[PDB]
RNA sequence: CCAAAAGAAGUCUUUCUUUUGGUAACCAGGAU
């Protein structure tokens, strides 16, 4: 549509969108360039927040500096963070297992406050991992994604909880800071206002107020409008400020002698000295907004103040009093109401920059601790800024973050859509967020403030449902971490084109209409009554004069993955959730095909994911090949694009890239120049178009099972390539000298045929489980001084030749060609982990066809494993001899409420055959509002039905009534959309017509070949002698507690006794039963399991005298 | 056709210098040949291009 | 056919074989059911090869 | 219970004897 070479996909959309879809990877990239402080972010903030532009690093270095000693006779300060160029390109870093990072330098200045001798230096602060142009990090070769975290913003939260004993309303307030100490004010069943500083027992608020320097006269002067505060003051029992300080000291400081100076200083230290208490800028902003204190002054300062505390107490007591609004002296009035903590005005987003800033902050705190401890144990005038700084904790924090965290994860690379979905994810679980096992049902709900900001459909189906969400298409995150959505403001009933981004609170104040409303070509609603959203998400019918805003489009409340489901509004939310979640499990196929009926989101999602090659500058193609494309730019310069051929992804799939241009074509900037894994000419192509029938067939498509044609196996329609990675390295060791070689002890030559002259197998050789990939031997150890042997070694010269082959064998259940071998070595001064001499990596590839038990799926949540694969002759075939490819059961459709698949089938038939609306005498009425150049289409036409503005039922019916014949003038599918099929197995025609069409089905990464496993006997564990677990070792299936209850219920005592003794851990029973079976004898009697004896020994180790009596 | 042998390639998952397609696409294109033989034993046909 | 089953080098690329000449087949029957009960069918079979 | 080496018999490749050699916990992600 707005891409220079996109395919012509004609849309059914009736509406027009004013706003283009933003960059879909803007969250990550605009959050990181704020952290490092790029000029791009500087300009972006200038045209917005020019009042105070500062990056994350500069903020950390400003809050840290200066670092002073108690005497104040010397200080250390930091400034001007600076980055060098990256150490190596992205491709080299990924190939050689190097972290993609850049050096960081700061200017530390040391001042002696009694000699004025200033000493500045440039201090190296470590290597800082840098984000690539696709929103990912490259840590130790692998590609990672940092996920954005949904947390609760810091501020003041008022809530009311009923009381069981008295049936009274009990209000409360919590002042949650960033990295500080809490303090709650509450009204208990008795009419008194308490306080819980830090986390202690309730104390009257009067104690705190007096400790802050308030006389009993001032309190009753300002807080004289409530009976509760007077009641609390009267029964205070505390007179004098010092007494209040002492009481607070008693409560807070356990078992210490109270005094005046310590109590005076500790209270101000806890909440007012900003080294132990911070609110951030978001917290200060939220407190000022809730209480309305400083509307004008800019936010500089992050500590509490007496004004804030007194205002909070007054707000709480007036809320309990039942007031409506409150004005604070020196500040505008505000409404008095309780808070909802699940409101997207109270939940903010910690993006990829905020998290790294927090980690740098703790690292710098540790470093400054070391610095100020080291400033007192070194003699002055020998100190230089380089001898105080210890950079190791800082670099340690970064490593800990990027290696160990629940937000730093391996990038999801099942297919291109998976990674884009991974980068736009908002997870509520992490360090500092709630927990999967401790999350209720009120936080998993879809609050009405999510509209336009978090997609209500796309979320995990398991125990993570509701705790992980995804960002909508048009949403952006503002400077404080709050999500915004564009709205089209309507002035005096005229729908303008001024787009304004509103966060959930502003959207709360106003009244918002709907996108699919009847605009009359002049920005005027046809009727006065339109559905709107009122304050608490209420939906009503307001006359079209109060409306303030309208949505920029439908498809504003959905995310990227959910915007690719055609006919989404005909499917219930339960099945649409599955349809969106199963699109990121599809596996790339050997050849890709774009859907006949899409939604128009595929091109944008494909170009923004980044798996395609896009012309950086316009020019003319000079050379094309399977390996590269050379573009000749309009001005002299040339550029060569290299391709990724058969490269493994994080999940073991193929990552091909092939060109889609010829040697003479001219390309334009931003034009797709080479396809990717799951792209067909620049558009996402996750599956294939299959001819489908919707009948029950002989019980093989029974209960969600599926029937496939054998053509899909012969013609490699659903074939995929899977690649495996195997690693081994040679390490020094204390004994020394690990070696990769062909000379392996106790190995014959027949099992050393595929290996090349120096170990590793040859490229192209097919392997089976157990074959050796890299030959390797290590010292046998047991360095022993046996007289004759040792005296022969020492002077006579007998060699050690102690070897123990730790070779690399291909594990159980694996095979395929050897496509690549990557060998590192210390001889070539390659950067390897310390103590490693050599490192070799072998890639093994398989090509898998579709087979029974493999999982398939559509875009509407119609999953199911393949039940049978019929020969092409015994399948229902059309009157012209065309067999169907897939057969789906009827009983699954009407009960699940996903009728969108039937409409997709009808429109797919119409698109495949091509149509022509006969406007011989006037266009038909059903085709009146149908866009032009949709009145006719050629066979195999690609169309698009946007998610909430697509093809109506009347238009589908009309298109079905007029559809082109195939070769002879025969129309196979009638106006109802059904065809007369023949039974290819018996020969007779089926008595009634059946629904046929084209559906777009996907192959999911749940194949049987990874799921099948069996075991007679094999490896056993060590501590307990039970069999191992897992397919790669061998392992047995687990016979758990529930399966034991089932067998006890049946009454089968002998089966249960043998299963637990002579099949698991009866060490002599195992061998005896094997011998009895092979020799044809009777199975012997079981003994005692070994785990019971292990249990007895552990109990005895706990100093318990366990003994078995007779 | 029962098998092929490209001289410069060792397996199906590689690329030929100068050819716009890769070996997998070449095999998928050859999978559309229609040929008729007259003798039971296998025979070989050659293809050379410069 | 797996490369190991036959005696073949690394350069051999086994290929799936489809020895079917016929492309598409269909039929229709013209049943004449008169009132006097002298009936018969008429098979019209259509064959298309590659 | 398996591998390697040596000796003996026959078969043209098995048997007998001797020597050497022979796993877990965390965190994360999925499925029903």
Short mmCIF file of N, CA and C (backbone and C1' of nucleotides) in Angstrom, two decimals, chain A residues 406 409 585 746 748 780 855 863 1006 1020-1022 1028, chain D residues 1 3-4 20-24 28-32:
data_model
loop_
_atom_site.label_atom_id
_atom_site.label_comp_id
_atom_site.label_asym_id
_atom_site.label_seq_id
_atom_site.Cartn_x
_atom_site.Cartn_y
_atom_site.Cartn_z
N UNK A 406 14.38 -13.12 34.59
CA UNK A 406 13.14 -13.58 33.98
C UNK A 406 12.65 -12.63 32.90
N UNK A 409 15.52 -12.97 28.06
CA UNK A 409 15.19 -14.31 27.59
C UNK A 409 15.80 -14.53 26.22
N UNK A 585 3.60 -20.55 16.52
CA UNK A 585 4.17 -21.88 16.61
C UNK A 585 4.34 -22.53 15.25
N UNK A 746 40.45 -48.35 21.99
CA UNK A 746 39.39 -49.36 22.04
C UNK A 746 38.32 -49.15 20.99
N UNK A 748 37.43 -49.47 16.78
CA UNK A 748 37.85 -50.13 15.54
C UNK A 748 37.95 -49.13 14.40
N UNK A 780 43.79 -40.07 31.30
CA UNK A 780 43.08 -41.03 32.13
C UNK A 780 43.23 -40.73 33.61
N UNK A 855 0.71 -32.01 14.12
CA UNK A 855 -0.32 -31.06 14.51
C UNK A 855 -0.45 -29.99 13.43
N UNK A 863 -7.45 -26.40 15.72
CA UNK A 863 -6.31 -27.29 15.75
C UNK A 863 -6.77 -28.75 15.65
N UNK A 1006 4.91 -29.27 16.69
CA UNK A 1006 4.55 -30.31 17.65
C UNK A 1006 4.55 -31.67 16.96
N UNK A 1020 20.63 -46.10 34.36
CA UNK A 1020 19.99 -45.89 35.65
C UNK A 1020 20.68 -44.74 36.39
N UNK A 1021 19.99 -44.22 37.39
CA UNK A 1021 20.50 -43.10 38.18
C UNK A 1021 21.60 -43.62 39.11
N UNK A 1022 22.16 -42.74 39.94
CA UNK A 1022 23.32 -43.09 40.75
C UNK A 1022 22.96 -43.20 42.22
N UNK A 1028 16.64 -43.38 34.33
CA UNK A 1028 16.73 -41.96 34.06
C UNK A 1028 15.44 -41.46 33.43
P C D 1 25.26 -61.08 30.63
"O5'" C D 1 25.45 -59.54 30.27
"C5'" C D 1 24.37 -58.78 29.75
"C4'" C D 1 24.81 -57.40 29.34
"C3'" C D 1 26.05 -57.33 28.46
"O3'" C D 1 25.75 -57.57 27.09
"C1'" C D 1 26.22 -55.74 30.21
P A D 3 30.49 -55.71 21.81
"O5'" A D 3 31.70 -54.68 21.92
"C5'" A D 3 31.62 -53.40 21.31
"C4'" A D 3 32.85 -52.57 21.60
"C3'" A D 3 34.18 -53.19 21.20
"O3'" A D 3 34.47 -53.03 19.83
"C1'" A D 3 34.33 -52.35 23.40
P A D 4 35.27 -54.18 19.03
"O5'" A D 4 36.78 -53.98 19.50
"C5'" A D 4 37.47 -52.77 19.22
"C4'" A D 4 38.77 -52.69 19.97
"C3'" A D 4 39.73 -53.85 19.77
"O3'" A D 4 40.47 -53.75 18.56
"C1'" A D 4 39.57 -53.36 22.07
P U D 20 43.51 -56.66 34.12
"O5'" U D 20 43.36 -55.49 33.05
"C5'" U D 20 44.44 -54.61 32.77
"C4'" U D 20 44.05 -53.55 31.78
"C3'" U D 20 42.80 -52.76 32.11
"O3'" U D 20 43.03 -51.72 33.04
"C1'" U D 20 42.69 -53.47 29.87
P G D 21 41.84 -51.22 34.00
"O5'" G D 21 40.82 -50.51 33.00
"C5'" G D 21 41.22 -49.37 32.24
"C4'" G D 21 40.26 -49.07 31.12
"C3'" G D 21 38.82 -48.79 31.54
"O3'" G D 21 38.64 -47.47 32.02
"C1'" G D 21 38.84 -50.28 29.70
P G D 22 38.19 -47.20 33.54
"O5'" G D 22 36.89 -46.29 33.40
"C5'" G D 22 35.60 -46.81 33.68
"C4'" G D 22 34.85 -47.16 32.42
"C3'" G D 22 33.37 -47.45 32.58
"O3'" G D 22 32.58 -46.27 32.65
"C1'" G D 22 34.35 -49.14 31.26
P U D 23 23.91 -43.16 34.45
"O5'" U D 23 24.06 -42.09 35.62
"C5'" U D 23 23.87 -40.71 35.38
"C4'" U D 23 24.10 -39.89 36.62
"C3'" U D 23 23.19 -38.68 36.79
"O3'" U D 23 21.92 -39.01 37.33
"C1'" U D 23 25.43 -38.02 37.14
P A D 24 20.65 -38.08 37.01
"O5'" A D 24 20.75 -36.89 38.06
"C5'" A D 24 20.69 -37.13 39.46
"C4'" A D 24 21.21 -35.95 40.24
"C3'" A D 24 20.33 -34.71 40.21
"O3'" A D 24 19.31 -34.76 41.19
"C1'" A D 24 22.58 -34.12 39.74
P A D 28 12.16 -18.86 36.75
"O5'" A D 28 12.20 -19.09 35.18
"C5'" A D 28 12.94 -18.22 34.34
"C4'" A D 28 13.10 -18.78 32.95
"C3'" A D 28 11.82 -19.19 32.25
"O3'" A D 28 11.10 -18.10 31.73
"C1'" A D 28 13.46 -20.87 31.95
P G D 29 9.51 -18.20 31.52
"O5'" G D 29 9.36 -19.12 30.23
"C5'" G D 29 10.03 -18.77 29.03
"C4'" G D 29 9.95 -19.89 28.02
"C3'" G D 29 8.55 -20.42 27.74
"O3'" G D 29 7.84 -19.59 26.83
"C1'" G D 29 10.04 -22.23 28.05
P G D 30 6.26 -19.79 26.65
"O5'" G D 30 6.15 -21.10 25.76
"C5'" G D 30 4.96 -21.87 25.75
"C4'" G D 30 5.23 -23.28 25.30
"C3'" G D 30 4.04 -24.22 25.37
"O3'" G D 30 3.18 -24.09 24.26
"C1'" G D 30 5.93 -25.26 26.34
P A D 31 1.59 -24.04 24.47
"O5'" A D 31 1.19 -25.57 24.58
"C5'" A D 31 1.70 -26.52 23.66
"C4'" A D 31 1.41 -27.92 24.11
"C3'" A D 31 0.02 -28.16 24.66
"O3'" A D 31 -0.94 -28.33 23.63
"C1'" A D 31 1.62 -29.14 26.09
P U D 32 -2.45 -27.83 23.84
"O5'" U D 32 -3.14 -29.02 24.65
"C5'" U D 32 -3.09 -30.35 24.16
"C4'" U D 32 -3.34 -31.35 25.26
"C3'" U D 32 -4.62 -31.16 26.06
"O3'" U D 32 -5.76 -31.67 25.40
"C1'" U D 32 -2.81 -31.55 27.54
#
